[PDB]
Amino acid sequence: LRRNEQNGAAAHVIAEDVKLLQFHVATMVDNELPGLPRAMQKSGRPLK
Amino acid sequence: SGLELYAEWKKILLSPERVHEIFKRISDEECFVLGMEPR
Amino acid sequence: VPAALKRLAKYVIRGFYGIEHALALDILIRNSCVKEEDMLELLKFDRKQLRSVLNNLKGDKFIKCRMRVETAADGKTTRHNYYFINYRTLVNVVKYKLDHMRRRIETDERDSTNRASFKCPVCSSTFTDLEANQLFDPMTGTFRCTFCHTEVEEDESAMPKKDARTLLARFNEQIEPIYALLRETED
Amino acid sequence: GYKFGVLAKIVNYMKTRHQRGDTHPLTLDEILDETQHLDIGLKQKQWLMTEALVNNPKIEVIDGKYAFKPKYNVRDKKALLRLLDQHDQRGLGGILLEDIEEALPNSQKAVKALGDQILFVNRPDKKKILFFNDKSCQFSVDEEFQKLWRSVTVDSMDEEKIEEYLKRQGI
Ligand SMILES: [Zn+2]
């Protein structure tokens, strides 16, 4: 995201990147969010 | 809708920074009214 | 619509903004009210690239956007977008981009001072004069990090600061002309 | 189907003639003899003459005999530059480099002769779009200045906070 903002990347690129960043942060805080995908550990086991 | 906010009066996405700036603009006295200790 | 406002908008947009966006501002100048689809047809650019530029423009609120609903002869639901430039919004948005440019330079200047002078190669990190002095021992007679066991030189810090100072002067000269145009606008 | 690919073949033959270089317009019946269109019915030819020949923009009509318009396609680099200037003035937009290439021999040399006056933009299909430069106003933008621009985001700044910043800074 920092590099995209530095380069002035596409607004939709930055929007999707911010969406993924929000997803990652919220998932780290809580992996049991209602009606949202679960973050696996590349082996099918949901992260704690 | 999931983990994103939409403000509809027409309807636009509400980025976190907007809420951050609004909360910063909020004064300390209003925190007591809202039942949140400012300090 | 005095010509002075148009002159300000043209000069600022042409000198201190992007060419691809200036292409759209040209359409905005040509017509006060344009359909979004008509703006697309005039622009002759891909929808995805245009929508990226439009998202940037929406964020900066350079041009105000309104939504209008009307019933077509066929009767199928249709969504119609109108974008039009507002001088009062544009003047402030441009002016502040200008203004915050300076706050950034001042913050960089202050960070330069914030950085610590002492730096030690074996350590590979910046060190406070404080830490260097505590590491120094009166019996040994020389001041030297306790941990790495090598002398510390501060000359390396000086160089980049001097380079930045030169850049700031060039920025001031390049930004000089636009302020007179701004003054003509306030007139 | 019937009576469509034949028309396409005629139009392609016209392009082949133009790769030949015969500016002199030709008779439609002679074109049919060259393209082996005698078998086709006469009525379809008459319908083509009345409607399709006029609709086709490339086709032109002179002294009762049909041929391409030698004015439509670019012939000299100076005229290309003038056309670009007129298109910029009237908001037409740029023209496709593939069409300009088939129009004009050594179009790439023409563009090299243009140099700075002509601005070319790449496209995913590799087609090149050309825009005239503005002589009246010339400006230079430096990369460091563009970066210092780029970081700052007014979208972060809230409109009321905008008018408030002006009022605070006492002006
Ligand atoms: Zn050390």
UniProtKB/Swiss-Prot annotation, chain C:
It is found in: Nucleus. Disulfide bonds: none annotated. The modification N6-acetyllysine is found at K58. Residues 5-95 form the HTH TFE/IIEalpha-type domain. Zn(2+) binds at C120, C123, C145, C148. A zinc finger (C4-type) spans 120-148. Belongs to the TFIIE alpha subunit family. Tetramer of two alpha and two beta chains. Interacts with TAF6/TAFII80. Interacts with ATF7IP. Interacts with SND1. Part of TBP-based Pol II pre-initiation complex (PIC), in which Pol II core assembles with general transcription factors and other specific initiation factors including GTF2E1, GTF2E2, GTF2F1, GTF2F2, TCEA1, ERCC2, ERCC3, GTF2H2, GTF2H3, GTF2H4, GTF2H5, GTF2A1, GTF2A2, GTF2B and TBP; this large multi-subunit PIC complex mediates DNA unwinding and targets Pol II core to the transcription start site where the first phosphodiester bond forms. (Microbial infection) Interacts with varicella-zoster virus IE63 protein. Recruits TFIIH to the initiation complex and stimulates the RNA polymerase II C-terminal domain kinase and DNA-dependent ATPase activities of TFIIH. Both TFIIH and TFIIE are required for promoter clearance by RNA polymerase. This is General transcription factor IIE subunit 1. It comes from Homo sapiens. The chain holds residues 10 to 196 of 439 of the full protein.
UniProtKB/Swiss-Prot annotation, chain D:
Its main location: nucleus. The gene is GTF2E2. Residues 1-75 bind DNA. Belongs to the TFIIE beta subunit family. The chain holds residues 72 to 242 of 291 of the full protein. It is found in: Nucleus. Recruits TFIIH to the initiation complex and stimulates the RNA polymerase II C-terminal domain kinase and DNA-dependent ATPase activities of TFIIH. Both TFIIH and TFIIE are required for promoter clearance by RNA polymerase. Tetramer of two alpha and two beta chains. Interacts with FACT subunit SUPT16H. Interacts with ATF7IP. Interacts with SND1. Part of TBP-based Pol II pre-initiation complex (PIC), in which Pol II core assembles with general transcription factors and other specific initiation factors including GTF2E1, GTF2E2, GTF2F1, GTF2F2, TCEA1, ERCC2, ERCC3, GTF2H2, GTF2H3, GTF2H4, GTF2H5, GTF2A1, GTF2A2, GTF2B and TBP; this large multi-subunit PIC complex mediates DNA unwinding and targets Pol II core to the transcription start site where the first phosphodiester bond forms. This is Transcription initiation factor IIE subunit beta. It is linked to Trichothiodystrophy 6, non-photosensitive: A form of trichothiodystrophy, a disease characterized by sulfur-deficient brittle hair and multisystem variable abnormalities. The spectrum of clinical features varies from mild disease with only hair involvement to severe disease with cutaneous, neurologic and profound developmental defects. Ichthyosis, intellectual and developmental disabilities, decreased fertility, abnormal characteristics at birth, ocular abnormalities, short stature, and infections are common manifestations. The modification N6-acetyllysine is found at K3. One of its GO terms (biological process) is transcription by RNA polymerase II. Keywords: Acetylation, Disease variant, DNA-binding, Nucleus, Phosphoprotein, Transcription, Transcription regulation. One of its GO terms (molecular function) is RNA binding. The keyword Nucleus applies. It comes from the Eukaryota. GO terms for cellular component: cytosol; nucleoplasm; transcription factor TFIID complex; transcription factor TFIIE complex.
